[PDB]
Write a protein that binds this ligand. Sequence first.
Ligand SMILES: NC(=O)c1cccnc1
Ligand SMILES: NC(=O)c1cccnc1
Ligand SMILES: NC(=O)c1cccnc1
Ligand SMILES: NC(=O)c1cccnc1
Lengths: 477, 480
Amino acid sequence: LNYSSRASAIPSLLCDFYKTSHRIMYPECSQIIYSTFTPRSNEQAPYLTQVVSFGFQAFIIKYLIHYFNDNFFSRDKHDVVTEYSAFIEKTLQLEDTGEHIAKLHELGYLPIRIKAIPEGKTVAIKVPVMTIENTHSDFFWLTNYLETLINVSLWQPMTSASIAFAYRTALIKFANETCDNQEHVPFQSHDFSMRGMSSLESAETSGAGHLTSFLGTDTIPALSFVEAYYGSSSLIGTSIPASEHSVMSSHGVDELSTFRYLMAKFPHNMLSIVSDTTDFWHNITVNLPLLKQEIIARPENARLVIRPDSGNFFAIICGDPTADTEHERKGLIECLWDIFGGTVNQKGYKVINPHIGAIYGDGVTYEKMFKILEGLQAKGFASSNIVFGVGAQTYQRNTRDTLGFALKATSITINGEEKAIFSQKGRVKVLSRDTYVDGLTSADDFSDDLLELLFEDGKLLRQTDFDEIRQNLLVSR
Amino acid sequence: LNYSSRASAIPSLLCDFYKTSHRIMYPECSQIIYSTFTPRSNEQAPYLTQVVSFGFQAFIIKYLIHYFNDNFFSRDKHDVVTEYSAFIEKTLQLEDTGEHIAKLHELGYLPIRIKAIPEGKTVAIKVPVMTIENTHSDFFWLTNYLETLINVSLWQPMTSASIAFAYRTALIKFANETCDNQEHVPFQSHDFSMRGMSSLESAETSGAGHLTSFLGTDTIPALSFVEAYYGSSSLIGTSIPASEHSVMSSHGVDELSTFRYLMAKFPHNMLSIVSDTTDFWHNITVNLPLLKQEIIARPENARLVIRPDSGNFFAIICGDPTADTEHERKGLIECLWDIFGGTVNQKGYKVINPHIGAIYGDGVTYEKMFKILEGLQAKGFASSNIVFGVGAQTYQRNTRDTLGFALKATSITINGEEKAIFKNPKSQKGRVKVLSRDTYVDGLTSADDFSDDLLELLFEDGKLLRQTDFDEIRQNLLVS
Ligand SMILES: NC(=O)c1cccnc1
Ligand SMILES: NC(=O)c1cccnc1
Ligand SMILES: NC(=O)c1cccnc1
Ligand SMILES: NC(=O)c1cccnc1
């Protein structure tokens, strides 16, 4: 959209250094490189059984169209080539005249053709999600030249999106046993991760990935990102006012006043109050009873949400048999049940008085979330009683090997002959969610391909919005 | 910095959402918020015993100066404020006039004062590396508001630089035991990580951190990133021509031909050839002897470097005693020793013929690198015989909890009184002064001394007050 960052990365050198040397290492009369992008393995995260296609549109627009147009094709040819040549002389000591860079510049666009799975659709592990190839014989080198830029910018949004989807899967499973409806699920995983992401750019694409399965986020720039590259008719994401530790302790030690003060500031909004700044169980067992009348007086769409931020994840929410105190043996959810109202649903699980709520957002991971819900189900509490603030220990603590993303070349054309290069071999076609076929030539029939032409020769050929992406994911279930 | 990328982040909403609700939550007559950025623990990575200060200068310039000048202060004001109000309107159903945003805009600069450890200096775990506060009473909320952007963009460069330092420390330690000199050390950790970083921005700052201790990198944007924000007189980074699997297999299964083809293409440069596309040990035990004559004829400055990319990291390099074949029972390094020349140095370790080299860059981690070097020294091989391609399993496989980074507010001024704020569910209180490398004092007020503070004033009221270049950073780190 209408803002801008100053950049240093040279468009024609947006790669691993060694890719500059590959053009002349290729056989003579090389014409076409065909490559595949694949989530090859989930042994490091077996709960990720579906890979959610997400991020391509943003990547195409930001880098392949805008970054190259703004900083390469728009600039003067002589300056761009002289910079490339000069770099290769200082760093490495060889004469590269950059004549291939100039030829590309004269072309005016990337002779690149990309097919990808529609965003919001999902595929099994080991199924290709993207293919790329060059469309002009002189630029065989360009396909793999772009390998570095492709997955430095795409593996994170898909891993985030696929993690979000797996969370929702677990949350729906629990709602089917403990809850009469699933109205709470779009809000049950709230993105907390921004401050712990490795950079703002990683915060936008990972946050955007979370928004494909959930409405709750604290990463405002992820909202702005989804709006700039995808768009939707309704609100992209939602959030609530919430206190932080500095706010609580700046009000001193009488937290009974601070609770009351903060609740007056947000009379008609949902409001989270971090409650462990001084003495958590004092807040829960002493001040919450004193506030009960004021709590239940607030409108239902303005519930007070209690946020612990310390102690063992399971014991705080579900309780510790190892005692000393019953409040510690019962845990937060049972304590709120004792204090405030509640009902029992058709499925037979306790639902807390909807005037009070609870959020745990302290290093939340998938197995911690799962254990907590298993804990609550065992005590007879509906899974809708807890919200999870999901942070960097979920969305930052990944690598390209979480789902095993690799962009590997699988077919080459030399002197008019196409040969498979060595998983997959040759050109690929995706038949369903969990099956694909390879060993294909460019003459074969791709009519029934799930991979959809996306970008070719500088043009975005097919555009989606975030409403379509989210609908595609509903159907995926 | 003569390029630009298109941006989506709204300057005045560039934060955790709940920070927008915090301004009206603070006590009335709040004036100054003072915060510290501290690496509190290395329990998750005990090999990181020192924190390398790195990344502040670039962050200040890119974001606190350029991004806010380009996208906020230079913009309209009515448009900038209306955008903020409308967002608050959509998302909180609350009516915020955006006056505080307008007051910021009328000010023309961030009323912000920042002290930091000079870049390249080093600090013990648990010592604050940066403090920030507001310089204008109306803008207490601004300190709070910037917490999210500060560590979304600063913990990674410091963690990468701190990892690089720990690597170099280990390599120097081994070079001291096994090697006559340590000229090999600046190239022994080569940055492979770019494709495995989570974004280009993270690749730039992590790669920059790597370049503070090492010259070898494949992350071209990390070089030009260092160029733009720091500058350097000496060489920032270097690399060599090297093949990839797609190059090898497009030539087919006759790799002996391919080797000859590739080394003919780069007769006057060092050249790495990935060697496991079809049959690794066939290339090692058959093709390398057939090429020995051709290899050793190449110039000093143009060695061939063999790149394994599969198998067990230790077994490939150091050998597997349980293995069924003699070449596998010894390592790649002993095999290269048998095939090509070698000498024994003053320290008594074998140094392979410098016409041939070896690089391992397949999921390299600090203990993996360490185990391999124990492997080679146990065999009597100098630690200089191997180069490590260090990838995303080192620089992407981190979180902010690797070094325990936390940005906490420690002092608030309310109605002209400074109060320590803290939680007791590090726990600093008040203003901090770093007395030495490994010690600081914290119960301070703004009236105290602060002479000779290791945290040195860096940015104030829109101005970068103190700037370094990449040479000073490397010099500080050498003396460290
Ligand atoms: N209470 C919150 O909204 C929050 C957001 C991000 C991180 N921690 C807490
Ligand atoms: N209870 C919640 O949905 C929620 C959302 C965001 C932050 N804290 C709590
Ligand atoms: N051999 C190399 O230069 C290299 C660079 C990046 C990743 N893998 C290998
Ligand atoms: N310095 C080296 O040996 C080397 C090997 C591979 C890639 N880059 C550098």
